[PDB]
Amino acid sequence: WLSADFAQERRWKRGVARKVVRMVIRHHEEQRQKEERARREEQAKLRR
Amino acid sequence: KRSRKESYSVYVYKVLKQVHPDTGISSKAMGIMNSFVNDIFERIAGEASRLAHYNKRSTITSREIQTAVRLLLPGELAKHAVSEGTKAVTKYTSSK
Amino acid sequence: RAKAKSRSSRAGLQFPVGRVHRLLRKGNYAERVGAGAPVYLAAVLEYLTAEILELAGNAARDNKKTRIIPRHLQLAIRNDEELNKLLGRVTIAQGGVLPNIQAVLLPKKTESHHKA
Amino acid sequence: KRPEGMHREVYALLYSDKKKVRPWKWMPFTNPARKDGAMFFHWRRAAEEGKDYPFARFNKTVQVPVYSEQEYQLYLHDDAWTKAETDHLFDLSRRFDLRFVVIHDRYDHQQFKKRSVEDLKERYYHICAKLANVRAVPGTDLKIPVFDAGHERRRKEQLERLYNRTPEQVAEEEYLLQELRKIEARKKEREKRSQDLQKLITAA
Amino acid sequence: DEVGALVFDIGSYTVRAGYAGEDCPKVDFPTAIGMVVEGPTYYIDTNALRVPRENMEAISPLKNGMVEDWDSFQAILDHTYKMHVKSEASLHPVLMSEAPWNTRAKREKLTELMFEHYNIPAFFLCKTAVLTAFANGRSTGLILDSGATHTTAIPVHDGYVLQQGIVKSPLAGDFITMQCRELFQEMNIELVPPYMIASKEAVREGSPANWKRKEKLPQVTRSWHNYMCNCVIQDFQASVLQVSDSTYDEQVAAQMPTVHYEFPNGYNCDFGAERLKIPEGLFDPSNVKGLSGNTMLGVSHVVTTSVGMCDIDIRPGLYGSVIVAGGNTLIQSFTDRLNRELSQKTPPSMRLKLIANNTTVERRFSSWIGGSILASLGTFQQMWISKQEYEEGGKQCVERKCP
Amino acid sequence: DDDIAALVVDNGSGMCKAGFAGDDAPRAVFPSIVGRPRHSYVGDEAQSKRGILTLKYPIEHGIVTNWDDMEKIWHHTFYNELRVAPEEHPVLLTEAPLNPKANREKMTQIMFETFNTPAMYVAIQAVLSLYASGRTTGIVMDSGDGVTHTVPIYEGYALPHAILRLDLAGRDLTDYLMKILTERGYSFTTTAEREIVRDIKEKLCYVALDFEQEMATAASSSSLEKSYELPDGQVITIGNERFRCPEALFQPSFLGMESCGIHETTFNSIMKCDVDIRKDLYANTVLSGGTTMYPGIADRMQKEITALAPSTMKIKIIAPPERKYSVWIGGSILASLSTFQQMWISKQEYDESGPSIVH
Ligand SMILES: Nc1ncnc2c1ncn2[C@@H]1O[C@H](COP(=O)(O)OP(=O)(O)OP(=O)(O)O)[C@@H](O)[C@H]1O
Numbered sequence A: 001w002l003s004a005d006f007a008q009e010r011r012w013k014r015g016v017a018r019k020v021v022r023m024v025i026r027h028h029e030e031q032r033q034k035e036e037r038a039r040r041e042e043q044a045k046l047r048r
Numbered sequence B: 001k002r003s004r005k006e007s008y009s010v011y012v013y014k015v016l017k018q019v020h021p022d023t024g025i026s027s028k029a030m031g032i033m034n035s036f037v038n039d040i041f042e043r044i045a046g047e048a049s050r051l052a053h054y055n056k057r058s059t060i061t062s063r064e065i066q067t068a069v070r071l072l073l074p075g076e077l078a079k080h081a082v083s084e085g086t087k088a089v090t091k092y093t094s095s096k
Numbered sequence C: 001r002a003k004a005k006s007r008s009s010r011a012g013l014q015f016p017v018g019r020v021h022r023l024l025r026k027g028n029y030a031e032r033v034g035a036g037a038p039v040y041l042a043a044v045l046e047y048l049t050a051e052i053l054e055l056a057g058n059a060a061r062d063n064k065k066t067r068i069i070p071r072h073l074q075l076a077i078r079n080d081e082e083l084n085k086l087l088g089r090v091t092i093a094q095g096g097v098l099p100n101i102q103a104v105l106l107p108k109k110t111e112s113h114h115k116a
Numbered sequence D: 001k002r003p004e005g006m007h008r009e010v011y012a013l014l015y016s017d018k019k020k021v022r023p024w025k026w027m028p029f030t031n032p033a034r035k036d037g038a039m040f041f042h043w044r045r046a047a048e049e050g051k052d053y054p055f056a057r058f059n060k061t062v063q064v065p066v067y068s069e070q071e072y073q074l075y076l077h078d079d080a081w082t083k084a085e086t087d088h089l090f091d092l093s094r095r096f097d098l099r100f101v102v103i104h105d106r107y108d109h110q111q112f113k114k115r116s117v118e119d120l121k122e123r124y125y126h127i128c129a130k131l132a133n134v135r136a137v138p139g140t141d142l143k144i145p146v147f148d149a150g151h152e153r154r155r156k157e158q159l160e161r162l163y164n165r166t167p168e169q170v171a172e173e174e175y176l177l178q179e180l181r182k183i184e185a186r187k188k189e190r191e192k193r194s195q196d197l198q199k200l201i202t203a204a
Numbered sequence E: 001d002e003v004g005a006l007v008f009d010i011g012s013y014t015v016r017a018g019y020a021g022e023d024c025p026k027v028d029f030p031t032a033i034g035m036v037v038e039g040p041t042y043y044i045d046t047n048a049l050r051v052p053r054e055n056m057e058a059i060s061p062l063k064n065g066m067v068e069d070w071d072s073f074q075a076i077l078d079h080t081y082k083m084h085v086k087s088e089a090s091l092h093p094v095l096m097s098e099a100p101w102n103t104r105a106k107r108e109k110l111t112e113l114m115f116e117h118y119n120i121p122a123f124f125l126c127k128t129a130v131l132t133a134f135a136n137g138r139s140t141g142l143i144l145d146s147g148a149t150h151t152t153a154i155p156v157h158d159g160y161v162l163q164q165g166i167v168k169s170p171l172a173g174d175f176i177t178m179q180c181r182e183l184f185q186e187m188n189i190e191l192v193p194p195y196m197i198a199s200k201e202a203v204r205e206g207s208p209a210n211w212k213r214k215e216k217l218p219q220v221t222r223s224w225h226n227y228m229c230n231c232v233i234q235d236f237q238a239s240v241l242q243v244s245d246s247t248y249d250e251q252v253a254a255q256m257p258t259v260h261y262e263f264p265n266g267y268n269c270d271f272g273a274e275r276l277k278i279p280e281g282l283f284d285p286s287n288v289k290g291l292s293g294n295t296m297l298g299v300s301h302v303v304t305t306s307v308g309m310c311d312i313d314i315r316p317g318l319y320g321s322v323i324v325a326g327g328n329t330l331i332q333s334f335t336d337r338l339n340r341e342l343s344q345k346t347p348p349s350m351r352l353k354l355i356a357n358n359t360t361v362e363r364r365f366s367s368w369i370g371g372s373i374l375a376s377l378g379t380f381q382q383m384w385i386s387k388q389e390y391e392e393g394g395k396q397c398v399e400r401k402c403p
Numbered sequence F: 001d002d003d004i005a006a007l008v009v010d011n012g013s014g015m016c017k018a019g020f021a022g023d024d025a026p027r028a029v030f031p032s033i034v035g036r037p038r039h040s041y042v043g044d045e046a047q048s049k050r051g052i053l054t055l056k057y058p059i060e061h062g063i064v065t066n067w068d069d070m071e072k073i074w075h076h077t078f079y080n081e082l083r084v085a086p087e088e089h090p091v092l093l094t095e096a097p098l099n100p101k102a103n104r105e106k107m108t109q110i111m112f113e114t115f116n117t118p119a120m121y122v123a124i125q126a127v128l129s130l131y132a133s134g135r136t137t138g139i140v141m142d143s144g145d146g147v148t149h150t151v152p153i154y155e156g157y158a159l160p161h162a163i164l165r166l167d168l169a170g171r172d173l174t175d176y177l178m179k180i181l182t183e184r185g186y187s188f189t190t191t192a193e194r195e196i197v198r199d200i201k202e203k204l205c206y207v208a209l210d211f212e213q214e215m216a217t218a219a220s221s222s223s224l225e226k227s228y229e230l231p232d233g234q235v236i237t238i239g240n241e242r243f244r245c246p247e248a249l250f251q252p253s254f255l256g257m258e259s260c261g262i263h264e265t266t267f268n269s270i271m272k273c274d275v276d277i278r279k280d281l282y283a284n285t286v287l288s289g290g291t292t293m294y295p296g297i298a299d300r301m302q303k304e305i306t307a308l309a310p311s312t313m314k315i316k317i318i319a320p321p322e323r324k325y326s327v328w329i330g331g332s333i334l335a336s337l338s339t340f341q342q343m344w345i346s347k348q349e350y351d352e353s354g355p356s357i358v359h
């Protein structure tokens, strides 16, 4: 019971670490994409 | 080099065990149940497709499937399916 | 990424909403299937399967059996008023029609004492 | 006007077809499964500070019998076994949950002569059966199914012979395997068919 | 069930100490700690040992997986307790691993040493094979641990080790280090450890290294110099060596892609068939120079011998649970070669099965993870050696509570 | 939404980087000290009364105790964070390099109990520091005040088997400086003035680049006497300390407490890692901590790791230009994150499991 739990927990912990790392990478990439989208928002405000 | 064929035996045995814990089902009975599942699937899908096409619609939506269930299932059998589907959709969009 | 959750679990269905939507999107039934169509279809399929399985198990317990067989499915489908209406055109392999009772033979005629 | 106000899909489907105060604390606890009273610690809730340790129920020890010196000297006397040679067996049984595959290894071969697994198990079961036969009221399973150590010995020997088969008893053994069917078919289909055909020729 | 404890996995190469219930040990440092007789000073930190100073003759507090210097053992325990653990031993039970071939005299002396010096609340001394089986999800099975000093196949049946089935072979990390030494000496490669290098310049492949020697050198011993050289050799092993898929064939060995590696001094060269001829000695010690002798049992031979000395009734289970662990097991293609040899040797009836744990953490720290999950069980609470048990029954209590 | 409410803390023994999260800088900080009568104050008041109070550091090279000292640290942090809990408070606290169980369990339990927070979390400073940039692996030096972490955080997981540390980050460096002074010019001789002493390094922190130049920095005899000024105005022309104790960090033997230099310390730290992973360990070396500003540390680390590392691997430095609070920046990037809401600990899972949660 406890060994299956520990193995699943190790796998889930590594998965969550991958999740958080990919999430911070997404945060940075989305910050830059948000700068680009602020330029596009200037364009869209001209359009409006 | 395997030629795997799919089936609903996995969701039907589960349903059977959740509704009848002590009663099993034979392989041929499982095949008959799968055939019924596929037949009802085809019927509902075709009815929803035709209903959407009548209204000049290119998308089958939950409303089309709901009206198709109203049409196909007879008497006091449609209502239950419609209620189950609505309660599943409401519980699905609620992010549970 | 976040722990992936299936669509059958979200709605609360046993039958596969994923495989349903799969068969639908590449089944040519439409051009762009809606997100809710497969959920509703799987829910109705699950309800009908649960009902027929309940009836088949009841028939099996009445017949004193544990494994459901085409006999039980046929009996359940032809006994229910609405399932028979839904499956009137359907025929089942190794099935049978509803039988008649032979007790009527006894109080009309049986073998006599002649050379018994 | 349309009431709506809810989710698009659910809305269409429905209408279109009309303070905590429980502190965790580091608590000491005594395990009833122990006789030394060792005090351990556990992360428990505040609502159960003092409750018995639940895992103590998982302490069902094996039922190894205990007997007195007089009982031994009277009934369990054996020419090939002495008290120093017998008590150790039951000690190991009590210590390792009465499994003889581990007890054999634990046998002290320095002070004691070498013993196999089967003879150790036989001695143990014989001691148990004697203790039962010399007991009437406690109902110690008087009719114990003591295994036959000789049958067990020959089984251990024949399967060990079947174990080492590398050169030809595992690869060329396919020949004897095919022969298992050939002799069960060819012998019959030859001799019994000869009898049948002789009877036919007699009738013919 | 889970109580604040400290699981100690004192291996011959590295010692792993951490809290029970964790997925990895809290600290992992080399066991060959440097020593200076000043009492004697010991350094139990990688940053405090591999340093260009402080002669630090390597005492290796343990050898052959058993304690050999109780003073150095006390020193390393103290350092592990107040360097990374940083907690009073009297507040945490201790579950420590032991070699299966550990004598009772040691066991008892170690037990008493942790009650009259550290005054720990509870103690337990479990065998490494039992812990390995415990971690990999098997109560019965064969534990193949190819450590630094020896490669051993330890058959575990129902959580207990079968001593009669223990088979050991000296073909271990030490043998690989010796073979790498011989290879370097044959190829005219000067093994220069890092502490002797002041600076280096990039040179072409195969050309002499262009490095400058530090003027203010440390006062190192032959032991510490050999220790640094062995660390470099182990890095080379982890970087280059690869086990041959099948029996070593010189013709096939010359058709494999080479592996590039640069020594600390800058010398770099590609290795062809020499990197696949060294790991062959582990499985086939016949084709080994200087090892003239056939008594040495290879990995597969060790496994087959360990399984053969056990009762046939459990040999099927042993073959069905053959757990592979140890640092040497991390060499590339080692697992494949082992599985192939065992399938060729294992009889057909015996279903051979190799547990699929091959990660560095899963392999090198298997023994520690075993005790980590063993001390986190509520059932294990009734097996502890309590201070009262030791005070009453004495040092010999280790033989009854944890045989 | 814990994102818009996020709170972060990094106490250590150098400076308490705490306050409301959401911005790219600490809302407010205090030197993380507590004081009591000799025969209670915290934060700036304790720093002001250091000459008359019995100051103690609730953080001791990583070890922390929260019944009065760290509890008062948190009570002062309450001034930096938002006011009474129900307003805004997802709380992540300051974990040490490696003291997972003892620190995490007790800290979480006692903080939940005291502040009653419906939300909280815990994590090591290493991952939250690496999140400042975002990449596969980091060997962050994290030389703060009481610890010099060698954390090889591969894929955001602090590998403990390869984790090492050094002790010359904060008070050791400042003490070595204070004792090198008064051997060369003015100085002080008490902890009451160690702050004005470290105020010499907070402005002049050029490194010597020893072992490659090793004499020319001082032999130039020009453009090195920046003459740091004391409150009185003394112009003693700060000398070899311009080159002494930037290297004591990289050469502990220079101080007297001996250990692997920071460069070789991190080198060994990555050497203990896997052989297939150590590739991106060289090319993703990050530097964190207040003691890492030291503009010359970048080139020194490059040179030393190149000397030790193989030629095939290049030493790519990505040390943020504002690495002063790299820990806080990445910690807020992690906490202030909408999709991170599902990983916080609340009353429900607390009551079901308790502080004995995975940690
Ligand atoms: N990455 C690697 N690749 C290949 N071999 C390695 C690697 N790391 C270590 N080794 C080898 O493994 C050996 C270390 O073995 P290990 O420390 O796993 O044994 P151990 O667990 O200490 O054994 P025991 O518990 O009996 O002391 C070293 O001698 C080294 O040669």
Ligand SMILES: Nc1ncnc2c1ncn2[C@@H]1O[C@H](COP(=O)(O)OP(=O)(O)OP(=O)(O)O)[C@@H](O)[C@H]1O
Binding pocket: F010, F011, F012, F013, F014, F015, F016, F059, F061, F062, F125, F142, F143, F144, F145, F146, F147, F148, F169, F170, F171, F174, F198, F201, F202, F203, F205, F289, F290, F291, F292, F293, F294
């Ligand atoms: N402006 C500055 N310029 C240069 N160095 C500075 C400056 N401000 C602070 N420092 C140095 O940074 C150190 C502060 O350490 P810091 O607060 O980063 O420790 P910490 O990492 O929070 O604690 P721990 O090491 O326990 O994690 C001080 O010792 C000081 O010498």
